[PDB]
Design a protein around this nucleic acid. Structure first.
Length: 82
DNA sequence: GTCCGATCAACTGTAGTTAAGCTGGTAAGAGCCTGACCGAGTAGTGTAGTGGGTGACCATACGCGAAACTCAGGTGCTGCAATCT
């Protein structure tokens, strides 16, 4: 049901991998504030290459835009509903 | 271009103006090398940006193997009937 409510599909058939789904859960927790890709990377505990390669699987669910943070160039992520 | 021949001075006869250096004590040209002052020269440097190639991580593909699932093989008794008696 959590899978279905967030992705629109059940765990039994959804195309999103477990790691990418946990990324989505972090964006779900942050809601209206959303998460920048580096704080997401730090909180999930994985590197920016891995985060970027995974985020492709969910870019249709997320509104995004560029921003500059701690001298690095990053994007903000928000679920469409927020 | 050349022709005539007048004519400043070329090259030719003797009558009269120019240094060099001596006695010195001396300031005058022409000068030398260290030093200082700015302009220019030798040239590697200081940020800043374009491109490229390495590295990691992924997924996509086949191909071999592993277990799954479907459908039909195979076991063994005995309910019922028929051969030998």
């Amino acid at each position: 049901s959590l899978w279905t409510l967030l992705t629109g599909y059940t765990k039994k058939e959804s195309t999103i991998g477990n790691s990418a789904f946990e990324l989505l859960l972090e964006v779900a927790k942050s809601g209206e504030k959303g998460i920048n890709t580096m704080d997401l990377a730090q909180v999930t505990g994985q590197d920016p290459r891995s985060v970027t390669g995974r985020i492709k699987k969910i870019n249709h669910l997320l509104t995004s835009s560029q921003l500059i943070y701690k001298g690095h160039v990053v994007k903000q992520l928000k679920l469409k509903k927020f």
